[PDB]
Symmetry: C2
Amino acid sequence: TLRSVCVFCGASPGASPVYQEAAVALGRHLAERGLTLVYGGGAVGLMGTVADAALAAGGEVIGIIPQSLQEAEIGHKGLTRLEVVDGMHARKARMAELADAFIALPGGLGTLEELFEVWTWGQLGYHAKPLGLLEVNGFYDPLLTFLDHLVDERFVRAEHRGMLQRGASPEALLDALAAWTPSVA
Amino acid sequence: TLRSVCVFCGASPGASPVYQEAAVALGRHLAERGLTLVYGGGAVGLMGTVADAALAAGGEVIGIIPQSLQEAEIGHKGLTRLEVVDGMHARKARMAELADAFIALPGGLGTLEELFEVWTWGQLGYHAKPLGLLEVNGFYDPLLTFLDHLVDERFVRAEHRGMLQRGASPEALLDALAAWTPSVA
Protein backbone atom coordinates (compact mmCIF):
# COMPACT_ATOMS: atom_id res chain seq x y z
CA THR A 1 0.00 0.00 0.00
CA LEU A 2 1.43 3.28 -1.20
CA ARG A 3 0.43 6.39 0.64
CA SER A 4 3.08 8.93 -0.57
CA VAL A 5 5.15 9.09 -3.78
CA CYS A 6 8.22 11.27 -4.23
CA VAL A 7 8.53 12.78 -7.67
CA PHE A 8 11.85 13.92 -9.19
CA CYS A 9 11.57 16.23 -12.20
CA GLY A 10 13.19 19.12 -14.04
CA ALA A 11 13.39 22.65 -12.78
CA SER A 12 12.93 23.64 -16.43
CA PRO A 13 9.74 23.12 -18.40
CA GLY A 14 11.34 21.42 -21.38
CA ALA A 15 11.38 22.34 -25.04
CA SER A 16 7.90 21.17 -25.88
CA PRO A 17 4.41 20.93 -24.30
CA VAL A 18 4.55 17.13 -23.88
CA TYR A 19 6.62 17.39 -20.68
CA GLN A 20 4.16 19.72 -18.93
CA GLU A 21 1.24 17.58 -20.17
CA ALA A 22 2.81 14.53 -18.55
CA ALA A 23 3.50 16.41 -15.35
CA VAL A 24 -0.09 17.53 -15.20
CA ALA A 25 -1.34 14.00 -15.78
CA LEU A 26 0.92 12.63 -13.05
CA GLY A 27 0.01 15.25 -10.49
CA ARG A 28 -3.68 14.91 -11.13
CA HIS A 29 -3.52 11.14 -10.95
CA LEU A 30 -1.66 11.05 -7.63
CA ALA A 31 -4.29 13.29 -6.01
CA GLU A 32 -7.20 11.28 -7.59
CA ARG A 33 -5.63 8.21 -6.10
CA GLY A 34 -5.46 9.67 -2.59
CA LEU A 35 -1.64 9.73 -2.65
CA THR A 36 0.50 12.44 -1.10
CA LEU A 37 2.92 14.07 -3.48
CA VAL A 38 6.38 14.55 -2.00
CA TYR A 39 8.76 16.67 -4.08
CA GLY A 40 11.57 19.29 -3.99
CA GLY A 41 9.21 22.18 -3.27
CA GLY A 42 9.80 24.38 -6.31
CA ALA A 43 7.46 26.61 -8.26
CA VAL A 44 9.59 26.52 -11.51
CA GLY A 45 9.51 24.19 -14.47
CA LEU A 46 8.02 20.73 -14.15
CA MET A 47 8.31 20.95 -10.28
CA GLY A 48 5.73 23.76 -10.41
CA THR A 49 3.54 21.95 -12.87
CA VAL A 50 3.27 18.63 -11.01
CA ALA A 51 2.58 20.38 -7.68
CA ASP A 52 -0.06 22.71 -9.16
CA ALA A 53 -1.84 19.83 -10.85
CA ALA A 54 -1.95 17.74 -7.65
CA LEU A 55 -3.17 20.78 -5.66
CA ALA A 56 -5.88 21.69 -8.27
CA ALA A 57 -7.18 18.13 -7.91
CA GLY A 58 -7.36 18.49 -4.13
CA GLY A 59 -4.32 16.41 -3.27
CA GLU A 60 -1.86 16.88 -0.43
CA VAL A 61 1.60 18.16 -1.45
CA ILE A 62 4.72 18.24 0.72
CA GLY A 63 7.71 20.24 -0.63
CA ILE A 64 11.20 19.65 0.79
CA ILE A 65 13.70 22.43 -0.04
CA PRO A 66 17.23 23.29 1.23
CA GLN A 67 17.65 26.77 2.75
CA SER A 68 20.05 27.60 -0.09
CA LEU A 69 17.34 27.15 -2.78
CA GLN A 70 14.71 28.72 -0.51
CA GLU A 71 16.66 32.02 -0.24
CA ALA A 72 17.16 31.75 -4.05
CA GLU A 73 13.35 32.27 -3.87
CA ILE A 74 12.28 29.23 -5.95
CA GLY A 75 9.91 27.81 -3.18
CA HIS A 76 6.24 27.00 -3.65
CA LYS A 77 3.84 29.12 -1.62
CA GLY A 78 0.67 27.04 -1.89
CA LEU A 79 1.62 23.58 -0.63
CA THR A 80 0.25 21.58 2.23
CA ARG A 81 3.69 22.05 3.80
CA LEU A 82 6.99 23.34 2.65
CA GLU A 83 9.84 21.94 4.71
CA VAL A 84 13.09 23.97 4.68
CA VAL A 85 16.09 21.84 5.58
CA ASP A 86 19.86 22.15 5.95
CA GLY A 87 21.48 21.12 2.71
CA MET A 88 20.93 18.96 -0.32
CA HIS A 89 21.83 15.78 1.47
CA ALA A 90 19.26 16.40 4.22
CA ARG A 91 16.74 17.26 1.51
CA LYS A 92 17.15 13.98 -0.34
CA ALA A 93 17.11 11.96 2.86
CA ARG A 94 13.86 13.68 4.02
CA MET A 95 12.24 13.15 0.64
CA ALA A 96 13.12 9.46 0.83
CA GLU A 97 11.98 9.21 4.43
CA LEU A 98 8.46 10.41 3.54
CA ALA A 99 8.07 8.43 0.35
CA ASP A 100 6.77 4.91 -0.26
CA ALA A 101 7.92 4.97 -3.88
CA PHE A 102 9.76 7.26 -6.33
CA ILE A 103 8.90 8.51 -9.86
CA ALA A 104 11.24 10.41 -12.21
CA LEU A 105 9.56 12.58 -14.80
CA PRO A 106 11.88 14.10 -17.41
CA GLY A 107 14.51 16.49 -16.08
CA GLY A 108 18.18 17.30 -16.16
CA LEU A 109 21.28 16.62 -14.09
CA GLY A 110 19.60 17.21 -10.73
CA THR A 111 16.71 14.87 -11.53
CA LEU A 112 19.20 12.21 -12.53
CA GLU A 113 21.44 12.62 -9.49
CA GLU A 114 18.38 12.31 -7.24
CA LEU A 115 17.17 9.20 -8.98
CA PHE A 116 20.52 7.43 -9.06
CA GLU A 117 21.21 8.25 -5.44
CA VAL A 118 17.86 6.90 -4.18
CA TRP A 119 18.36 3.88 -6.42
CA THR A 120 21.79 3.24 -4.94
CA TRP A 121 20.28 3.48 -1.43
CA GLY A 122 17.96 0.65 -2.49
CA GLN A 123 20.76 -1.39 -3.89
CA LEU A 124 22.70 -1.03 -0.70
CA GLY A 125 19.70 -2.25 1.40
CA TYR A 126 18.81 1.08 3.00
CA HIS A 127 15.19 0.87 1.72
CA ALA A 128 13.16 -1.50 -0.33
CA LYS A 129 11.02 1.12 -2.12
CA PRO A 130 10.41 0.90 -5.85
CA LEU A 131 11.40 3.51 -8.41
CA GLY A 132 9.94 4.30 -11.80
CA LEU A 133 10.39 6.38 -14.94
CA LEU A 134 7.38 8.19 -16.37
CA GLU A 135 8.12 7.86 -20.04
CA VAL A 136 7.35 10.83 -22.27
CA ASN A 137 7.58 10.00 -25.94
CA GLY A 138 11.12 8.60 -26.40
CA PHE A 139 12.82 10.82 -23.84
CA TYR A 140 14.10 8.00 -21.60
CA ASP A 141 14.75 5.54 -24.48
CA PRO A 142 18.57 5.92 -24.64
CA LEU A 143 18.84 5.92 -20.84
CA LEU A 144 16.94 2.66 -20.77
CA THR A 145 19.22 1.17 -23.43
CA PHE A 146 22.21 2.26 -21.34
CA LEU A 147 20.69 0.80 -18.14
CA ASP A 148 20.12 -2.56 -19.81
CA HIS A 149 23.77 -2.48 -21.04
CA LEU A 150 24.83 -2.16 -17.38
CA VAL A 151 23.10 -5.43 -16.66
CA ASP A 152 24.49 -7.22 -19.75
CA GLU A 153 27.98 -6.02 -18.89
CA ARG A 154 27.54 -7.10 -15.24
CA PHE A 155 27.96 -3.79 -13.47
CA VAL A 156 24.39 -3.92 -12.21
CA ARG A 157 22.63 -7.04 -10.86
CA ALA A 158 19.33 -8.02 -12.49
CA GLU A 159 17.54 -7.70 -9.16
CA HIS A 160 18.73 -4.12 -8.73
CA ARG A 161 17.88 -3.24 -12.32
CA GLY A 162 14.39 -4.58 -11.51
CA MET A 163 13.77 -1.92 -8.83
CA LEU A 164 13.21 0.49 -11.68
CA GLN A 165 9.80 0.28 -13.36
CA ARG A 166 8.65 2.25 -16.35
CA GLY A 167 5.42 3.29 -18.10
CA ALA A 168 3.91 6.13 -20.24
CA SER A 169 0.67 6.06 -18.21
CA PRO A 170 0.68 7.43 -14.66
CA GLU A 171 -1.99 4.86 -13.72
CA ALA A 172 -0.05 1.86 -15.11
CA LEU A 173 3.29 3.06 -13.63
CA LEU A 174 1.72 3.59 -10.15
CA ASP A 175 0.12 0.12 -10.39
CA ALA A 176 3.57 -1.38 -11.10
CA LEU A 177 5.13 0.52 -8.17
CA ALA A 178 2.33 -0.44 -5.74
CA ALA A 179 2.66 -4.09 -6.60
CA TRP A 180 6.45 -4.26 -6.91
CA THR A 181 8.23 -7.01 -5.11
CA PRO A 182 11.68 -8.56 -5.52
CA SER A 183 9.86 -11.97 -6.10
CA VAL A 184 9.05 -11.06 -9.67
CA ALA A 185 12.68 -11.40 -10.63
CA THR B 1 47.37 22.62 -13.87
CA LEU B 2 45.94 19.36 -12.62
CA ARG B 3 47.63 17.73 -9.69
CA SER B 4 44.98 15.17 -8.55
CA VAL B 5 42.17 13.41 -10.46
CA CYS B 6 39.27 11.61 -8.80
CA VAL B 7 38.21 8.46 -10.60
CA PHE B 8 34.71 6.95 -10.31
CA CYS B 9 34.39 3.34 -11.47
CA GLY B 10 32.58 0.05 -10.89
CA ALA B 11 33.01 -2.15 -7.88
CA SER B 12 32.59 -5.03 -10.32
CA PRO B 13 35.11 -5.96 -12.99
CA GLY B 14 32.66 -6.09 -15.88
CA ALA B 15 31.75 -8.89 -18.25
CA SER B 16 34.79 -8.67 -20.46
CA PRO B 17 38.55 -7.87 -20.24
CA VAL B 18 38.21 -4.48 -21.99
CA TYR B 19 37.07 -2.74 -18.79
CA GLN B 20 40.07 -3.90 -16.75
CA GLU B 21 42.39 -3.05 -19.67
CA ALA B 22 41.05 0.50 -19.69
CA ALA B 23 41.36 0.79 -15.93
CA VAL B 24 44.95 -0.35 -16.11
CA ALA B 25 45.72 2.14 -18.86
CA LEU B 26 44.14 4.98 -16.89
CA GLY B 27 45.89 4.17 -13.64
CA ARG B 28 49.25 3.80 -15.29
CA HIS B 29 48.83 7.03 -17.21
CA LEU B 30 47.89 9.10 -14.16
CA ALA B 31 51.02 7.94 -12.31
CA GLU B 32 53.26 8.49 -15.43
CA ARG B 33 51.88 11.98 -15.56
CA GLY B 34 52.74 12.75 -11.93
CA LEU B 35 49.05 12.97 -10.96
CA THR B 36 47.61 11.77 -7.67
CA LEU B 37 44.80 9.29 -8.02
CA VAL B 38 41.89 9.99 -5.69
CA TYR B 39 39.22 7.28 -5.54
CA GLY B 40 36.75 5.38 -3.29
CA GLY B 41 39.44 3.21 -1.71
CA GLY B 42 38.26 -0.26 -2.73
CA ALA B 43 40.20 -3.37 -3.63
CA VAL B 44 37.30 -4.94 -5.70
CA GLY B 45 36.43 -4.67 -9.35
CA LEU B 46 37.66 -1.76 -11.41
CA MET B 47 38.40 0.24 -8.16
CA GLY B 48 41.08 -2.36 -7.36
CA THR B 49 42.41 -2.40 -10.88
CA VAL B 50 42.88 1.35 -11.33
CA ALA B 51 44.54 1.71 -7.91
CA ASP B 52 46.90 -1.25 -8.45
CA ALA B 53 47.94 0.04 -11.85
CA ALA B 54 48.71 3.54 -10.52
CA LEU B 55 50.63 2.03 -7.57
CA ALA B 56 52.65 -0.39 -9.82
CA ALA B 57 53.70 2.65 -11.85
CA GLY B 58 54.88 4.44 -8.71
CA GLY B 59 52.00 6.89 -8.42
CA GLU B 60 50.41 8.28 -5.28
CA VAL B 61 46.92 6.94 -4.48
CA ILE B 62 44.48 8.33 -1.91
CA GLY B 63 41.41 6.17 -1.10
CA ILE B 64 38.37 7.73 0.59
CA ILE B 65 35.97 5.16 2.13
CA PRO B 66 32.97 5.44 4.52
CA GLN B 67 33.24 3.45 7.77
CA SER B 68 30.26 1.37 6.61
CA LEU B 69 32.14 0.03 3.54
CA GLN B 70 35.38 -0.22 5.53
CA GLU B 71 33.83 -2.63 8.08
CA ALA B 72 32.36 -4.50 5.06
CA GLU B 73 36.11 -5.13 4.51
CA ILE B 74 36.36 -3.86 0.89
CA GLY B 75 39.24 -1.34 1.67
CA HIS B 76 42.59 -1.22 -0.09
CA LYS B 77 45.60 -2.04 2.07
CA GLY B 78 48.41 -0.72 -0.11
CA LEU B 79 47.54 2.91 -0.80
CA THR B 80 49.44 6.05 -0.02
CA ARG B 81 46.57 6.81 2.37
CA LEU B 82 43.19 5.37 3.03
CA GLU B 83 40.87 7.90 4.61
CA VAL B 84 37.89 6.47 6.56
CA VAL B 85 35.07 8.98 6.86
CA ASP B 86 31.56 9.23 8.29
CA GLY B 87 29.09 8.41 5.58
CA MET B 88 28.66 8.45 1.84
CA HIS B 89 28.00 12.15 1.71
CA ALA B 90 31.23 12.97 3.56
CA ARG B 91 33.03 10.54 1.26
CA LYS B 92 31.89 12.25 -1.92
CA ALA B 93 32.59 15.70 -0.53
CA ARG B 94 36.16 14.67 0.50
CA MET B 95 36.80 13.10 -2.88
CA ALA B 96 35.71 16.32 -4.56
CA GLU B 97 37.72 18.44 -2.15
CA LEU B 98 40.97 16.67 -3.09
CA ALA B 99 40.37 16.49 -6.81
CA ASP B 100 41.18 18.96 -9.59
CA ALA B 101 39.15 16.98 -12.12
CA PHE B 102 36.93 13.87 -12.30
CA ILE B 103 36.94 10.80 -14.61
CA ALA B 104 34.24 8.11 -14.81
CA LEU B 105 35.36 4.74 -16.07
CA PRO B 106 32.58 2.22 -16.69
CA GLY B 107 30.58 1.19 -13.63
CA GLY B 108 27.09 0.78 -12.30
CA LEU B 109 24.59 2.74 -10.24
CA GLY B 110 27.12 3.99 -7.69
CA THR B 111 29.50 5.25 -10.37
CA LEU B 112 26.63 7.09 -12.01
CA GLU B 113 25.30 8.63 -8.80
CA GLU B 114 28.80 9.89 -7.98
CA LEU B 115 29.26 11.39 -11.40
CA PHE B 116 25.87 13.08 -11.59
CA GLU B 117 26.21 14.47 -8.10
CA VAL B 118 29.65 16.02 -8.72
CA TRP B 119 28.35 17.31 -12.04
CA THR B 120 25.38 18.94 -10.35
CA TRP B 121 27.76 20.57 -7.84
CA GLY B 122 29.49 22.13 -10.84
CA GLN B 123 26.27 23.26 -12.36
CA LEU B 124 25.25 24.91 -9.15
CA GLY B 125 28.59 26.83 -8.94
CA TYR B 126 30.12 24.91 -6.05
CA HIS B 127 33.25 24.08 -8.12
CA ALA B 128 34.49 24.73 -11.57
CA LYS B 129 36.31 21.40 -12.08
CA PRO B 130 35.92 19.45 -15.30
CA LEU B 131 34.52 15.94 -15.61
CA GLY B 132 35.11 13.29 -18.22
CA LEU B 133 34.03 9.85 -19.42
CA LEU B 134 36.71 7.32 -20.32
CA GLU B 135 35.02 5.61 -23.21
CA VAL B 136 35.42 1.85 -23.51
CA ASN B 137 34.19 0.50 -26.81
CA GLY B 138 30.56 1.69 -27.05
CA PHE B 139 29.76 1.42 -23.35
CA TYR B 140 28.87 5.10 -22.82
CA ASP B 141 27.31 5.58 -26.29
CA PRO B 142 23.62 5.48 -25.22
CA LEU B 143 24.34 7.62 -22.16
CA LEU B 144 25.92 10.20 -24.42
CA THR B 145 22.92 10.13 -26.76
CA PHE B 146 20.67 10.64 -23.73
CA LEU B 147 22.84 13.51 -22.40
CA ASP B 148 22.69 15.31 -25.74
CA HIS B 149 18.86 14.85 -25.74
CA LEU B 150 18.81 16.71 -22.39
CA VAL B 151 20.40 19.68 -24.09
CA ASP B 152 18.12 19.54 -27.17
CA GLU B 153 15.08 19.31 -24.92
CA ARG B 154 16.36 22.20 -22.76
CA PHE B 155 16.68 20.49 -19.41
CA VAL B 156 20.43 21.01 -19.41
CA ARG B 157 22.22 24.19 -20.53
CA ALA B 158 24.90 23.84 -23.22
CA GLU B 159 27.50 25.28 -20.87
CA HIS B 160 26.75 22.67 -18.23
CA ARG B 161 26.72 19.86 -20.79
CA GLY B 162 30.18 21.15 -21.80
CA MET B 163 31.69 20.39 -18.36
CA LEU B 164 31.69 16.76 -19.41
CA GLN B 165 34.52 15.73 -21.73
CA ARG B 166 35.02 12.34 -23.29
CA GLY B 167 37.76 10.25 -24.92
CA ALA B 168 38.89 6.58 -25.42
CA SER B 169 42.52 7.51 -24.69
CA PRO B 170 43.54 8.36 -21.12
CA GLU B 171 46.14 10.79 -22.50
CA ALA B 172 43.67 12.65 -24.77
CA LEU B 173 40.94 12.76 -22.07
CA LEU B 174 43.39 14.13 -19.43
CA ASP B 175 44.59 16.73 -21.97
CA ALA B 176 40.97 17.86 -22.48
CA LEU B 177 40.37 18.04 -18.70
CA ALA B 178 43.61 19.97 -18.05
CA ALA B 179 42.79 22.53 -20.67
CA TRP B 180 39.04 22.81 -20.03
CA THR B 181 37.57 26.22 -19.69
CA PRO B 182 34.01 27.55 -19.99
CA SER B 183 35.35 29.90 -22.81
CA VAL B 184 35.28 27.09 -25.33
CA ALA B 185 31.51 27.13 -25.35
